Each structure stands twice: as structure tokens, then as C-alpha cells.
Design a protein around this ligand. Structure first.
Ligand code: 6A6
Lengths: 342, 268
């Protein structure tokens, strides 16, 4: 029942993804998010790599709608930028065009961990600062990430944006802002049954990433042990690193839904010789350093006592030599390999 | 509570792309004015605003979601003719798409169609003799066309949030807020949301509410740093609306006006 002239005119004019971009055999990613490809323009006006994401599913879901809605507004150098949306009418598929990041923290950290660490001086500091800058921009606009981890912290390769952090894969859709509807980067309050995502939950994750950048190992590493938030072995690992929190350290722990399950399962005497100081010393990081004192503020167990992203960016750590750089690689050669196609 | 992008209006897509020139709006309107008069066209806008309101109320959506859907509709028919897509199909599609921008609760397919069918039958039988003819596949097709026109611009700012800040600043919430809030609702019967930033619309509504209730707030309005001639422009549109309202019998007139609309031509 639509107007015919209107319908054919729009069909004539509508830019189709397959016509504009060459991407067959160039799949660099596959998950719940959907399909991600490395892509070049067929009509050779531009000469640079693009990330094409076909969203998983059909039509416009809540998740697709939210993601489009917010990425259309968000603009910041340390957050990944939506360039174009292609709506394929025949198969009802949504495609999203982004600039292409060759690297990410998961692969960078694995490359060092494979070696027998963070070879440019001040790469760790520069990464942390840009992560903090991107999250601060989101948080200022009341956008939570809600699933921060090394895999979705991208880093740009050779090109005009060399060694710039690009935060990606924001959890744009969660029903009622609720986690109840790996666990290595999940804040203790989420494990004890917190009903909502918060800014503080994103900050704990940055703290875990910061510990992993310094040491090359996930601070709260744990075996893959569920329709419930409570995860015993993940909590056990947090206490083995951090120690068990005193009443005075986290007064509102009693208000958490799984507190009576915590008391039932755990005895504090177990972790009496455990602390972040002792853990980081074993991995050759000095407790007197400004890096450590900032890490300890990021990894505070009580969410209300956890430092914000703004306050973290103001830390004297970033005023100490060496200073953060725009290019995290600091003009040095990039040893990390390119993305292999699937 | 809907805080996403709240303080970003001046760098938003709403401001940079969907605040239109009035003369450009009138120029695109001339193609539909060959069939309808200027008066008839404004009455259609009022009618379909009430249809979107009635759908929203039926689905238990909060006012802000209903407003966003109203804007999506207005934005579509600012660019294109009424013949291009049937506005009876577009209205529930706008409500459906607006509801998916929120993450607190979801509107189902079967529930949408049921609401569209029920509202037009119980509340708008003066305009529509026949039942809602569209199934869900038509909503899902229309959604794709709507999203494409809007250039994927989905976050819409409204006067309710600034209004709330202004009345709280006066210390006159119980006195002025209910009346000011309904006047904001009434401004969606007009083009105001395509022409002015929301905070200006909220100030105009709050001025009218003060005049109606005989509350001296001249000093408070003087303390603001804003273009007062732009507000007086908005005030005159609001006062004009209530004189249109008075002289318009929606129920008596809307069947005839709906038959004068240009119709979508079928394929060859
Ligand atoms: N490689 C990319 N450049 N620009 C992008 C914009 C988005 C995406 C993207 O969807 N994902 C999936 C989840 C977030 C991490 C990212 C990704 C990370 C590693 C990987 F091996 C494949 C994909 C990728 C790029």
C-alpha cells in the first residue's frame, strides 16, 4: 500500500553494502554481536581499511535499536565511531560501518604473556589514560559500558590514528539495566547479587585491566566453573588476592542479597595473609609506586569507596615521568601481528 | 530514568540536523497543499497527534516515549508527502520504534497490533469506518523506511526535563507544574518541536501557565539570559493553537479531510 513512485525512487538511490564494499573471505570476528569483517571500498576513492559489522539476528531488535541510537550521538577520539548504517531491505539485515582497528589488548597481552613485557616505556600508562578518557566521556553522558575487558579495548594500527585506544562493544541493551536478566572482570557487588549496573562497576573492570597490563596475567583468573549471580570460585580468587573485607571496609555489604550465602560459605581467617600489596610484590610491582596506589583505588571492594574515572585521570601517576602519549606505541615499531581472517 | 545523552543537546543530531528552517518546511509542504488547504493540513497534524497519544496511553508508555514517537512522525511528513506511506500505518510504527529506544520493558508484536486495532475502533470510529487493515509484516517494513529517512537519528530531546528544572527553580511545583506540563503536551499539536530548541518551548509554556493562573514571575524571567523575542514567537503559536482548538470540531470534520488526502498510487 505504499506509493509506487516513492518506493522505486528510494530503491534506485539506496546504497547497498555489497556494491560499496569488498569483504568476502575477510571475516575477522564472529560472536553473539554477529559477524565482523575487514573491508575496503570497491570504488577506490578512499584507500583505508573499514570494519563492517553485520548485526546478529533480523530486523531492528532492542539491542540493534539502542546501539544505533547511541552510536549516532557519541563522538570522542577514544570511543569507536559509527560511520554508516546500511539497512538491507531484502533479508532485513542491519550492517554498521566503523573505522578499522588492527589491534586490541587481548592479543597484545597474549603476545607478551607468550614471550619470556610492555616494551615501550609508558605504553601501560598511556593505554590506561585513554581507557579512562573514553569511559569518562561515556559516564558523563550517562552511558555505561557494562562488559569491559581486554578483548573490547581496541588499538589503532598504522595510519593517522596510530596507537590510539578505541573502546568498543558497549553493552547498549540490558533489560531494566539489570545483570540478573568469564567472570574475571566482574566487580564483587555483581557476584553478591547487585540488581543494577553502575559507573563503579565499569571502574573495577578498568582496575583489573590495569593489573593485567602491569603483570601480563589476569589478576582474578579463575577456572570456568548459571541463572545465578553468585560464583563461589570467582569470589574465592578475589579474596586470595585482595583479602577478606572488614566490616569497616564495606559497611553496606550486609544489604547485598547474597551476604548470608557469603557468610555461610566463607571464613575470614582463611585469607588472613592475603592482600593486594603481597600479590603485586610477587609480580615485581612496588607497593610504594604511584601505579600501585592508583590501582588500589580502582580495585576498592566497596563500590561507593571506589574512585571515579575523572578522579583517576587527575591522579599524580599521570604527572610522573614518563607522561602519557597519544600514540601508545610512542613512535616505536609495532611487533604485534595483523588480524588473521577466518 | 532516561539520563542517556542528557547534557549533549548542543552537539546532538537533534540540534545539528533536525532543527529546520520554517521556509524550507513550508516549501516541501506545497506538494500536499495542492489537495488540502493550510487549515486542513494543520488539522490532520492535530488529529494524528491525538492518535499517537491514544496508542501510547493504551500501551502504558510514559509521556516521553509518546513524544519521541510524535517527533518521528512529524520528521517523516516534514520531508515526504502524506501519499508516500499511509499515516494510519506510520503512527503505530513510530510508537513501536520509539518504545525500542528504551530498555525498561518491551512492546510485543501481538500487543502492538491489538492496541492499534482497539484504539481506532473505540476512540476514532468517527474518522475510520473500517477496521485497522495492517498486519505486523507491514509495521516491520514501514520501520525500515522510517529509520532510513531519519538518518538513524533516534535520541530526541523534549521540553519536560527543562520545564521540571525551571519550576523547581521558581519554587512553584504544586502551583504551576501540572498546567505547564499539559501546555507542553499541547505544543505537539504544532510544528514547534521542529523549529525551536526544547528549553525555549518549556519557558514559553511556563510563561503561559503563569498568565493563566495570574502569577507574577516577570522578575524571574528577567533573571534569565535568553532571547525573549524567540519566546514571544513561541507564545503566539501557543495562543493561536487554543483559538484553532476552539474553532475546530475534530469529530465532525476529520472523515472529510481524510478523504481529501492524496492517496498512494499502486504498481503498474
Ligand atoms: N576490528 C575492528 N575495527 N573496528 C571495529 C568495530 C567493532 C568491532 C567488533 O564488533 N568487535 C566485536 C566485539 C568488540 C570487539 C571487536 C572485535 C575484537 C577482536 C576481534 F578479533 C574481532 C572483533 C570490531 C572492530
Amino acid at each position: 500500500k505504499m506509493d509506487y513512485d516513492f518506493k522505486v525512487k528510494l530503491s534506485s538511490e539506496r546504497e547497498r553494502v555489497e556494491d560499496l564494499f569488498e569483504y568476502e573471505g575477510c571475516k575477522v570476528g564472529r560472536g553473539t554481536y554477529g559477524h565482523v569483517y575487514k573491508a575496503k571500498r570497491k570504488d577506490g576513492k578512499d584507500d583505508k581499511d573499514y570494519a563492517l559489522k553485520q548485526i546478529e539476528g533480523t530486523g531492528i531488535s532492542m539491542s540493534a535499536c539502542r546501539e544505533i541510537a547511541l552510536l549516532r550521538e557519541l563522538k570522542h577520539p577514544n570511543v569507536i565511531s559509527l560511520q554508516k548504517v546500511f539497512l538491507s531491505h531484502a533479508d532485513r539485515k542491519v550492517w554498521l560501518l566503523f573505522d578499522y582497528a588492527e589491534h586490541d589488548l587481548w592479543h597484545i597481552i597474549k603476545f607478551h604473556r607468550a614471550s619470556k613485557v610492555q616494551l615501550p616505556r609508558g605504553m601501560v600508562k598511556s593505554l590506561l589514560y585513554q581507557i579512562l578518557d573514553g569511559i569518562h566521556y561515556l559516564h558523563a553522558n550517562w552511558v555505561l559500558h557494562r562488559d569491559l575487558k581486554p578483548a573490547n579495548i581496541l588499538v589503532m594500527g598504522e595510519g593517522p590514528e596510530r596507537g590510539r585506544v578505541k573502546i568498543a562493544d558497549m553493552g547498549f541493551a540490558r533489560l531494566f539495566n539489570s545483570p540478573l536478566k568469564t567472570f574475571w572482570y566482574r566487580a564483587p557487588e555483581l557476584l553478591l547479587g547487585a540488581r543494577h549496573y553502575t559507573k563503579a562497576i565499569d571502574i573495577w573492570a578498568i582496575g583489573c585491566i590495569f593489573a593485567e597490563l602491569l603483570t601480563s596475567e589476569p589478576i582474578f583468573h579463575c577456572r570456568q566453573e548459571t541463572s545465578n549471580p553468585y560464583h563461589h570460585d570467582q569470589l574465592d580468587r578475589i579474596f586470595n588476592v585482595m583479602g577478606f573485607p572488614a566490616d569497616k571496609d564495606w559497611e553496606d555489604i550486609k544489604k547485598m542479597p547474597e551476604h548470608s550465602t557469603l557468610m555461610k560459605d566463607f571464613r575470614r581467617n582463611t585469607y588472613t595473609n592475603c592482600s593486594l600489596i603481597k600479590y603485586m610484590e610477587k609480580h615485581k610491582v612496588k607497593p610504594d609506586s604511584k601505579a600501585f596506589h592508583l590501582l588500589q583505588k580502582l580495585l576498592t571492594m566497596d563500590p561507593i569507596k571506589r574512585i571515579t574515572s575523572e578522579q583517576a585521570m587527575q591522579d599524580p601517576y599521570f604527572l610522573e615521568d614518563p607522561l602519557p602519549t597519544s600514540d601508545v606505541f610512542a613512535g616505536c615499531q609495532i611487533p604485534y601481528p595483523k588480524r588473521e581472517f577466518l | 530514568d532516561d539520563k542517556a545523552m542528557a547534557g549533549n543537546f548542543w552537539q546532538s543530531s537533534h540540534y545539528l540536523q533536525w532543527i529546520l528552517d520554517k521556509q524550507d518546511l513550508l516549501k516541501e509542504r506545497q506538494k500536499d497543499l495542492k489537495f488540502l488547504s493550510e487549515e486542513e493540513y494543520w488539522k490532520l497534524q492535530i488529529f494524528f497527534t491525538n492518535v499517537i497519544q491514544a496508542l501510547g496511553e493504551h500501551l502504558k508508555l510514559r509521556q516521553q516515549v509518546i513524544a519521541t514517537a510524535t517527533v518521528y512522525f512529524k520528521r517523516f511528513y516534514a520531508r515526504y508527502s502524506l501519499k508516500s506511506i499511509d499515516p494510519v500505518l506510520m503512527a503505530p510504527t513510530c510508537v513501536f520504534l520509539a518504545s525500542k529506544v528504551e530498555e525498561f520493558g518491551v512492546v510485543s508484536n501481538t500487543r502492538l497490533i491489538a492496541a492499534a486495532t482497539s484504539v481506532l475502533k473505540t476512540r476514532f470510529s468517527y474518522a475510520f469506518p473500517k477496521e485497522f487493515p495492517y498486519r505486523m509484516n507491514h509495521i516491520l517494513e514501514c520501520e525500515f523506511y522510517l529509520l532510513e529517512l531519519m538518518d538513524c537519528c533516534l535520541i530526541v530531546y523534549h521540553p519536560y526535563r527543562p520545564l521540571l528544572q525551571y519550576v523547581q527553580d521558581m519554587g512553584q511545583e504544586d502551583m504551576l507544574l501540572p498546567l505547564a506540563w499539559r501546555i507542553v503536551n499541547d505544543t505537539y499539536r504544532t510544528d514547534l518541536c521542529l523549529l525551536y530548541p526544547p528549553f525555549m518551548i518549556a519557558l514559553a509554556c511556563l510563561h503561559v501557565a503563569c498568565v493563566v493562573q495570574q502569577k507574577d514571575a516577570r522578575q524571574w524571567f528577567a533573571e534569565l539570559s535568553v532571547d525573549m523575542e524567540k519566546i514571544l514567537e513561541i507564545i503566539r503559536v501557543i495562543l493561536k493553537l487554543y483559538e484553532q482548538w476552539k474553532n475546530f470540531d475534530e469529530r465532525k470534520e476529520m472523515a472529510t479531510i481524510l478523504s481529501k488526502m492524496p492517496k498512494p498510487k499502486p504498481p503498474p
